């Protein structure tokens, strides 16, 4: 039931992803259903404080992206190799 | 279409492929300003030696 503010990320690769992780905003994807996947990017502070408490990996999340709400569920997270940092989050609608 | 390539670094320490690309574009000394066409081939050569040429 959390409300996370996202932003639609323009360009994707190794370079823009590492530039986002430098600028404190890890990227993430939303797939699921028959609609297209969507390329979101999130702040790191809010989502690490959310994924501390274990209802984040449990319940229905809600993403404020472009104003329009999206009900979604957290699926598959890649963490950092040797840090308390997040790399990427797979979301399923 | 016709663009202007210019050299900006020198070709002393570089690889055989970069020596060959600079010889094929025809830029001998630094500060050489040559005129070439605009082919995907010439765009690829500028992509290959992007660290020592300067296009306009």
């Amino acid at each position: 039931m959390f409300t996370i503010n996202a932003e639609v990320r323009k360009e994707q690769g190794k370079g823009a992803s590492r530039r986002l992780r430098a600028a404190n905003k890890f990227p993430a994807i939303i797939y699921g259903g028959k609609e297209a996947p969507l390329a979101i990017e999130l702040d790191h502070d809010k989502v690490m404080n959310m994924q501390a408490k274990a209802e984040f990996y449990s319940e229905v999340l809600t993403i404020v992206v472009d104003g329009k709400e999206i009900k979604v569920k957290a699926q598959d997270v890649q963490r950092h190799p040797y840090k308390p940092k997040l790399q990427h989050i797979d979301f399923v609608r | 279409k016709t663009i202007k390539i210019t050299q900006t670094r020198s070709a002393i320490g570089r690889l055989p492929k970069h020596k060959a690309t600079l010889l094929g574009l025809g830029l001998r000394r630094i500060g050489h300003t040559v005129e070439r066409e605009d082919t995907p081939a010439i765009r690829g050569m500028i992509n290959a030696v992007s660290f020592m040429v300067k296009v306009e």
Binding site: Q51, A54, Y57, S58, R79, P81, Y82, K83 | -
Partner: protein, 135 residues
């Protein structure tokens, strides 16, 4: 100590140690010791840290050793010239990358796990941090 009881070939290459690790998640237990540095553990260091943390938690609750030494490191002796074959096989190491979880523990409080993994991390050559389970 901790050596493979049978192997195909006696002496192995040196090899580099680059790239990130695999066993990052705390799979079995609840409280894990994650190596943040990069280096080689040995059979001596693994047995020393295991018996240290066993003394620390006073043998209550399960220990898990995750990495096992299976790469033999050889040493030429002293007063021996550089030629004449690869030297005799002395001891066994286990390569560690940044991210490898070495020990896990359950059936202990959190604070006792902190004290135990401190006590056993001070006998290992690689810099390590603490980590807990997640879901």
């Amino acid at each position: 100590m901790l050596q493979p009881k049978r192997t195909k070939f006696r002496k192995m290459h040196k090899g580099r140690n680059r790239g990130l690790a695999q066993g990052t998640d705390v799979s079995f237990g609840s409280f894990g010791l994650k190596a943040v540095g990069r280096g080689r553990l040995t059979a001596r260091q693994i047995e020393a840290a295991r018996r240290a943390m066993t003394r620390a938690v006073k043998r209550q609750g399960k220990i898990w050793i995750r990495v096992f030494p299976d790469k033999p490191i050889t040493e030429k002796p002293l007063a021996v010239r550089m030629g004449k074959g690869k030297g005799n096989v002395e001891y066994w190491v286990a390569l560690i990358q940044p991210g490898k979880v070495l020990y896990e523990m359950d059936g202990v409080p959190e604070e006792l796990a902190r004290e135990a993994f401190k006590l056993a991390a001070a006998k290992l050559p690689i810099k390590t941090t603490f980590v807990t389970k997640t879901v």
